[PDB]
Design a protein around this ligand. Structure first.
Ligand SMILES: CC/C=C/C/C=C/C/C=C\CCCCCCCC(=O)OC[C@@H](O)COP(=O)(O)OCC[N+](C)(C)C
Ligand SMILES: CC/C=C/C/C=C\C/C=C/CCCCCCCC(=O)OC[C@@H](O)COP(=O)(O)OCC[N+](C)(C)C
Ligand SMILES: CC/C=C\C/C=C/C/C=C\CCCCCCCC(=O)OC[C@@H](O)COP(=O)(O)OCC[N+](C)(C)C
Ligand SMILES: CCCCCCCCCCCCO[C@@H]1O[C@H](CO)[C@@H](O[C@H]2O[C@H](CO)[C@@H](O)[C@H](O)[C@H]2O)[C@H](O)[C@H]1O
Ligand SMILES: CCCCCCCCCCCCO[C@@H]1O[C@H](CO)[C@@H](O[C@H]2O[C@H](CO)[C@@H](O)[C@H](O)[C@H]2O)[C@H](O)[C@H]1O
Ligand SMILES: CCCCCCCCCCCCO[C@@H]1O[C@H](CO)[C@@H](O[C@H]2O[C@H](CO)[C@@H](O)[C@H](O)[C@H]2O)[C@H](O)[C@H]1O
Ligand SMILES: CCCCCCCCCCCCO[C@@H]1O[C@H](CO)[C@@H](O[C@H]2O[C@H](CO)[C@@H](O)[C@H](O)[C@H]2O)[C@H](O)[C@H]1O
Ligand SMILES: CCCCCCCCCCCCO[C@@H]1O[C@H](CO)[C@@H](O[C@H]2O[C@H](CO)[C@@H](O)[C@H](O)[C@H]2O)[C@H](O)[C@H]1O
Ligand SMILES: CCCCCCCCCCCCO[C@@H]1O[C@H](CO)[C@@H](O[C@H]2O[C@H](CO)[C@@H](O)[C@H](O)[C@H]2O)[C@H](O)[C@H]1O
Ligand SMILES: CCCCCCCCCCCCO[C@@H]1O[C@H](CO)[C@@H](O[C@H]2O[C@H](CO)[C@@H](O)[C@H](O)[C@H]2O)[C@H](O)[C@H]1O
Ligand SMILES: CCCCCCCCCCCCO[C@@H]1O[C@H](CO)[C@@H](O[C@H]2O[C@H](CO)[C@@H](O)[C@H](O)[C@H]2O)[C@H](O)[C@H]1O
Ligand SMILES: CCCCCCCCCCCCO[C@@H]1O[C@H](CO)[C@@H](O[C@H]2O[C@H](CO)[C@@H](O)[C@H](O)[C@H]2O)[C@H](O)[C@H]1O
Ligand SMILES: CCCCCCCCCCCCO[C@@H]1O[C@H](CO)[C@@H](O[C@H]2O[C@H](CO)[C@@H](O)[C@H](O)[C@H]2O)[C@H](O)[C@H]1O
Ligand SMILES: CCCCCCCCCCCCO[C@@H]1O[C@H](CO)[C@@H](O[C@H]2O[C@H](CO)[C@@H](O)[C@H](O)[C@H]2O)[C@H](O)[C@H]1O
Ligand SMILES: CCCCCCCCCCCCO[C@@H]1O[C@H](CO)[C@@H](O[C@H]2O[C@H](CO)[C@@H](O)[C@H](O)[C@H]2O)[C@H](O)[C@H]1O
Ligand SMILES: CCCCCCCCCCCCO[C@@H]1O[C@H](CO)[C@@H](O[C@H]2O[C@H](CO)[C@@H](O)[C@H](O)[C@H]2O)[C@H](O)[C@H]1O
Ligand code: NA
Lengths: 201, 475, 203
């Protein structure tokens, strides 16, 4: 099989211009296709033979000679903020790489901790939930009763249509017998030169 | 006042670029559009058909425009040649150029192919008519035509050799499809392609551009030779074209028996061999497996034709022209059967290439030997004859230039229907079956049709025509 | 137009087998290679291709796991997946261009190889005795095996986080940043009934 890789899985992209790069493990002779996939939809063909469009808008162009290929947008729009794949059709085993565009925004994290409810404590459970609803970038969550713990399940939405910001939910599942030591703290580490800590006792 | 030997040499050299560009296009344009230009074969079929159909259409229109050309200070045919050469070589260079376009590359190739065909017509038709203006005496015109018909063969050989040995030196990688994924449990790891002077697709495109530049340089040099060494005489005898009389004489020629038979016969035979010329490079690459040595096969065929022209001249002067045309066209039939019935042996393919070159020499030499026996019969049958062989040729050229475009377009469309892989390592069984049919079924059918037309030949070689020649002594 | 109609979402078990259909319209199916793909929260993988009037070519990873079949009397293609457990993904059928090697048209059919079918449990996670301007509420939906639909009564500040696996069941959370708090309720919608709406109280 021939290796195909997109160096950036996520690309922050305002308007103006945006270039998505694809690198092949072999000299594929400009036999590279580009597909666009929107959430909840199958992949749609954009470019084939590294330069030729298939009924697409004129903003979607592509260049590349050998082992290095690029897909450019003359101007990014709201529909263009989707996932993009580069396929080879040089050899019989076909391979993809994966890449996505994201809008550009500012910064500023948030955090809020919530203890387990009485209904959950009644039916033999205790889930402590940390919400990080508005931030831009990548973030990490640490759970500390007295030492850092690795018993948490984490989920992330996409990017908001209005705020263009990300969220995160970290759930620490712990039984009634494991609810002994006491205080739980949720620590968030964004680009803010300091972890935001929300604690409960 | 005689026509100089150097003047005839320059006139003959001026006709080399037409045959060089024609042989290069007819032998390599399909594989350039399919494997080098990386076009969809539907678009390549459109390009080939439209280009040759425009080659034909523009032949009589440019002929009519040339008939109305006034005598300038440089001549009646020289201004057309001089003012058409640079645009023709520019369009020929841009035929084999691959543009960096997101869409409509087929439009680029259509525009430049049709422009080059128009300008090559604007070069050849005045050139073809120049032989009536170089000298007043008919013997000097015949000598210049012998020099030309001769070089014309040398130019086809030179163009085939140059294009094949330039674009064949620099190879390129090929596409492997699911049919080439025939080994997964074996997991063969013979990584030997990297240990080579790695050639790329851009190297193949550059080789095509270098071949085009060499052919364009030869075009310019031969046009300069034709302009400098040949001067029009401006003869007092200037017969009018009379286009209404031209159409009436065309109907008269098509109404004649032996003339129509010669046409149908040649037409079908040349159509079969033009179909072979079109879809033989792909047959060598993908059925015979000679993706690196197909240019050598084409060169061997051309050399065999050049060495078999005197053999067929001796055959027609010795054993007559009936059996000569009965066996020359049908000589390639057993070898066309044999190439598609053997597992692509190199010696068998080279022997069949030699035999096919011999058959091509016969098929494109013998009707010109038959033609005086038809001209004498037409002069006996119709005492009033003013430009009948010229329109007979025009009809033959137009119908060959249209039906060969139709055949090549249908062939490339059938390749698209069969699933031709764009520069594939191996074609699927449907594409190989189509390529076997396009060299062993359709050409054989066309050759059989032409042979059946040539059987119904009331001239019966000279056995009546010589008697008509006696009537030529009577009139 | 050339299009491909696929079977709906399938929910097999760990050691079952699943057959995915792909009806082809607008082109001769026997003239093209129909391809099957694999997308599991990641890039697109390549199981195999099938020529509907001939051979089948697999990837060595999916040999013995996938089996491609073609009914040319129905213009249909089938992908039969054997033993499961990590095959929960989206499978796209797409016919190849006869010349190039890329896929013009595409499909899409979900496969979820899990076990169980339970009713979700709703917990009103609330504040811990604090308030400053706007406050953040929540709703924890834990222990279901389908796709839920969480809504809030006319309030648009919600961030419904994607569901995650914990064992063999799914967990989900919702957060609403409401400034004024007279009364708020979390109403969930599940396929197996259980349209439970629980109010969020203080402390
Ligand atoms: C087993 C191997 C089999 C192999 C096949 C390779 C085969 C045939 C090669 C060539 C056929 C054409 C080459 C001979 C040129 C004849 C020289 C000549 O002087 O004769 C022609 C003259 O008559 C001009 O007219 P022509 O119509 O031929 O122009 C056609 C133009 N167009 C392409 C658009 C149809
Ligand atoms: C390696 C390439 C070698 C290849 C072999 C293929 C074939 C053997 C070719 C052989 C002899 C060349 C035949 C030339 C065809 C006639 C030349 C031509 O291409 O013809 C142009 C035309 O425009 C001028 O001659 P014309 O019109 O007068 O025809 C009537 C002739 N005449 C009136 C004197 C009876
Ligand atoms: C590897 C190669 C080794 C060796 C070979 C050496 C080769 C040279 C190759 C080629 C040049 C041969 C050119 C042969 C031309 C054939 C055509 C011919 O030789 O003759 C045609 C005939 O049609 C002419 O017509 P005609 O002479 O009657 O003139 C007046 C006609 N008309 C009265 C009606 C106006
Ligand atoms: C591709 C690049 C290389 C190209 C190099 C240029 C080569 C040019 C070819 C010249 C070949 C000369 O060809 C030769 O010329 C002499 C004249 O000297 C001719 O001479 C003969 O024909 C003429 C006309 O019938 C007679 O008057 C003469 O008595 C007779 O000897 C021959 O017909 C020919 O055999
Ligand atoms: C690629 C170009 C295609 C060919 C385009 C046509 C070229 C120009 C045609 C000129 C032919 C003769 O042109 C005409 O000659 C007669 C003389 O009899 C003149 O009287 C006309 O004023 C002149 O228009
Ligand atoms: C683009 C590729 C196609 C190439 C087309 C080339 C065709 C060229 C057409 C012929 C040239 C027409 O231009 C021509 O020039 C000469 C000037 O000497 C003039 O023509 C004139 O020449 C002399 C006087 O000089 C006289 O015979 C007469 O009065 C007239 O024919 C006209 O101006 C025009 O008839
Ligand atoms: C004597 C023979 C040798 C002559 C050598 C002449 C040089 C030939 C080299 C080819 C250079 C032309 O290269 C070609 O130019 C044109 C216009 O710029 C480009 O064409 C492009 O621009 C034009 C703008 O009008 C648009 O139609 C479209 O955006 C696209 O087609 C081609 O994408 C490019 O491939
Ligand atoms: C050196 C000279 C360079 C050549 C310059 C002129 C070349 C023009 C050829 C057209 C190239 C392809 O142009 C294509 O045509 C049609 C409509 O126009 C469309 O398809 C494409 O949008 C366009 O890219
Ligand atoms: C680079 C592009 C391709 C350019 C190719 C140029 C190669 C030039 C090599 C010489 C070709 C000319 O070849 C020429 O053919 C004719 C054949 O009838 C011969 O001409 C001969 O026959 C004619 C007519 O019967 C008589 O005038 C005389 O008997 C004699 O001249 C010449 O003797 C020969 O010199
Ligand atoms: C009268 C004028 C016309 C003259 C016609 C002949 C002139 C040119 C002769 C060159 C013939 C070259 O002959 C041959 O060409 C091919 C490709 O170029 C090359 O062939 C070489 O590479 C291929 C690679 O598969 C193999 O067949 C082998 O390794 C070797 O033969 C060599 O170069 C030469 O073996
Ligand atoms: C009259 C007959 C004229 C014969 C002229 C023949 C000359 C042929 C020139 C071939 C020179 C090849 O030149 C080489 O080609 C390969 C093809 O990709 C290129 O790569 C190289 O960069 C280039 O140096
Ligand atoms: C009398 C002798 C006649 C000899 C005539 C020879 C002239 C042609 C020589 C071939 C040189 C071609 O040079 C070659 O051109 C092409 C484009 O034009 C370039 O190709 C470049 O341009 C385009 C940009 O869109 C890309 O498709 C390509 O990936 C890129 O590499 C090559 O980088 C360059 O190496
Ligand atoms: C940059 C590209 C250009 C490169 C050109 C390279 C090849 C150049 C060679 C051209 C051939 C020269 O040809 C030479 O021209 C003179 C013209 O004075 C001609 O000489 C003869 O021409 C005609 C013949 O009908 C007579 O009217 C004239 O009286 C006579 O002198 C000869 O045919 C030849 O001696
Ligand atoms: C103006 C005339 C132009 C000259 C060129 C015309 C030559 C004819 C082109 C070749 C087309 C035949 O090409 C061949 O035909 C057979 C049917 O007979 C077809 O065969 C294909 O389709 C049939 C279905 O009907 C399948 O059963 C078979 O397995 C498959 O190979 C393909 O189309 C092709 O393999
Ligand atoms: C005048 C005789 C006409 C014969 C024309 C040639 C037709 C031959 C019939 C072959 C039918 C099947 O052709 C098959 O194609 C596949 C291509 O993958 C080859 O492999 C087989 O060896 C061949 O048998
Ligand atoms: C002599 C005149 C000839 C008739 C005039 C030409 C009419 C047709 C013009 C082209 C119209 C569409 O062209 C035809 O349709 C499909 C789109 O469905 C095109 O597209 C097809 O090939 C491309 C790749 O090359 C694929 O990306 C695409 O998925 C596929 O459908 C083809 O390029 C062609 O087969
Ligand atoms: Na000719």
């Amino acid at each position: 099989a021939l290796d195909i890789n997109s160096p950036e899985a996520e690309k922050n992209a305002k308007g103006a211009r945006a270039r998505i790069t694809c690198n092949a493990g072999n000299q594929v002779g400009s036999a590279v296709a580009w597909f666009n996939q929107r959430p909840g939809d199958p992949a749609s063909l954009l470019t084939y033979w590294a330069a030729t469009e298939k009924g697409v808008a004129g903003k979607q162009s592509a260049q590349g000679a050998s082992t290095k290929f690029s897909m450019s947008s003359a101007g990014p729009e709201a529909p263009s903020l989707s996932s993009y794949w580069c396929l080879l059709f040089e050899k019989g085993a076909f391979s993809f790489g994966g890449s996505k565009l994201n809008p550009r925004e500012g910064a500023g994290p948030q955090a809020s901790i919530l203890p387990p409810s009485a209904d959950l404590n009644t039916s033999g459970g205790a889930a402590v939930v940390c919400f990080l609803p508005n931030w831009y970038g990548n973030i990490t969550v640490q759970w500390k009763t007295e030492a850092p713990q690795s018993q948490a399940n984490m989920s992330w939405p996409g990017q908001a249509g209005a705020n263009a910001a990300y969220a995160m939910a970290a759930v620490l599942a712990i039984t009634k017998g494991d609810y002994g030591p006491g205080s739980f703290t949720c620590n968030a580490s964004n680009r803010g030169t300091g972890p935001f800590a929300m604690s409960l006792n | 006042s005689r026509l100089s030997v150097c003047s005839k040499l320059c006139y003959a050299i001026g006709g080399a670029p037409y045959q060089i560009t024609g042989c290069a296009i007819g032998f390599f344009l399909q594989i350039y559009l399919l494997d080098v230009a990386l076009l969809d074969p539907f678009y390549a079929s459109i390009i080939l058909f439209v280009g040759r159909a425009w080659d034909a259409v523009t032949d009589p229109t440019v002929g009519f425009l040339v008939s109305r050309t006034p005598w300038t200070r440089f001549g009646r045919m020289m201004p057309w040649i001089v003012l058409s050469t640079p645009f023709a070589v520019l369009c020929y260079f841009l035929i084999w150029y691959v543009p960096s376009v997101d869409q409509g590359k087929v439009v680029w190739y259509l525009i430049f192919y049709c422009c080059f065909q128009t300008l090559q017509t604007c070069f050849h038709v005045p050139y073809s008519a120049l032989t009536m203006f170089i000298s007043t005496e008919q013997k000097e015109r015949d000598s210049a035509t012998a020099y030309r018909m001769t070089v014309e063969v040398l130019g086809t050989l030179i163009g085939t050799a140059i294009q094949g040995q330039i674009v064949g030196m620099a190879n390129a990688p090929c596409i492997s499809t699911e049919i080439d994924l025939q080994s997964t449990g074996l997991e063969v790891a013979p990584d030997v392609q990297i240990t080579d002077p790695h050639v790329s697709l851009q190297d193949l495109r550059n080789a095509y551009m270098i071949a085009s530049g060499v052919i364009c340089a030869i075009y310019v040099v031969c046009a300069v030779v034709l302009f400098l060494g040949v001067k029009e005489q401006k003869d007092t005898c200037r017969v009018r074209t009379e286009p209404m009389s031209f159409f009436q004489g065309i109907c008269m020629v098509m109404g004649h028996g032996p003339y129509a038979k010669l046409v149908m016969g040649f037409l079908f035979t040349s159509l079969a061999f033009m179909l072979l010329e079109g879809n033989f490079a792909l047959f060598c690459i993908y059925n015979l497996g000679f993706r690196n040595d197909f240019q050598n096969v084409l060169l061997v065929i051309m050399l065999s034709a050049t060495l078999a022209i005197p053999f067929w001249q001796w055959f027609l002067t010795k054993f007559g022209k009936k059996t000569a045309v009965y066996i020359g066209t049908t000589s390639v039939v057993p070898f066309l059967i044999s190439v598609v019935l053997v597992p692509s042996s190199l010696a068998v393919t080279y022997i069949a290439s030699f035999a096919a070159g011999v058959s091509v020499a016969a098929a494109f030499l013998l009707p010109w030997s038959m033609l005086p026996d038809v001209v004498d019969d037409f002069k006996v049958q119709n005492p009033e004859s003013q430009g009948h062989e010229a329109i007979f040729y025009s009809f033959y050229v137009f119908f060959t230039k249209f039906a060969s475009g139709v055949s090549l377009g249908v062939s490339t469309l059938s390749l698209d229907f069969a699933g031709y892989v764009t520069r594939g390592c191996t074609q699927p069984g449907e594409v190989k079956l189509t390529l076997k049919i396009l060299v062993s079924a359709a050409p054989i059918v066309l050759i059989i049709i032409g042979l059946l037309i040539f059987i119904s030949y009331p001239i019966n070689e000279e056995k009546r025509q010589g008697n008509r020649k006696l009537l030529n002594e009577q009139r | 137009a050339s299009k491909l109609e696929l079977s709906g979402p399938a929910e097999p078990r760990g050691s079952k087998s699943a057959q995915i259909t792909c009806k082809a319209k607008g082109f001769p199916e026997a003239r093209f290679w129909v391809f099957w793909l694999f997308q599991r929260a990641a890039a697109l993988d390549w199981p195999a291709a099938n020529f509907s009037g001939g051979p089948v070519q697999f990837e060595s990873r999916f040999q013995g796991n996938a089996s491609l079949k073609g009914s040319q009397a129905q213009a249909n293609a089938e992908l039969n997946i054997g033993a499961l457990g990590s095959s929960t993904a989206t499978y796209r059928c797409g016919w190849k261009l006869a010349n190039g090697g890329f896929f013009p048209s595409w499909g899409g059919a979900n496969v979820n190889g899990a076990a169980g079918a339970k009713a979700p449990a709703v917990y009103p996670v609330e504040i811990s005795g604090a308030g400053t301007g706007s406050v953040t509420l929540g709703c924890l939906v834990k222990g279901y095996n389908a796709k839920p639909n969480l809504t809030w009564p006319g309030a648009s500040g919600a961030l419904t986080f994607p569901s995650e696996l914990n064992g063999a069941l799914w967990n989900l959370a919702s957060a609403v940043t409401g400034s004024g708090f007279p009364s708020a309720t979390c109403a969930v919608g599940f396929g197996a009934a259980t349209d439970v709406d629980k109010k969020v109280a203080a402390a």
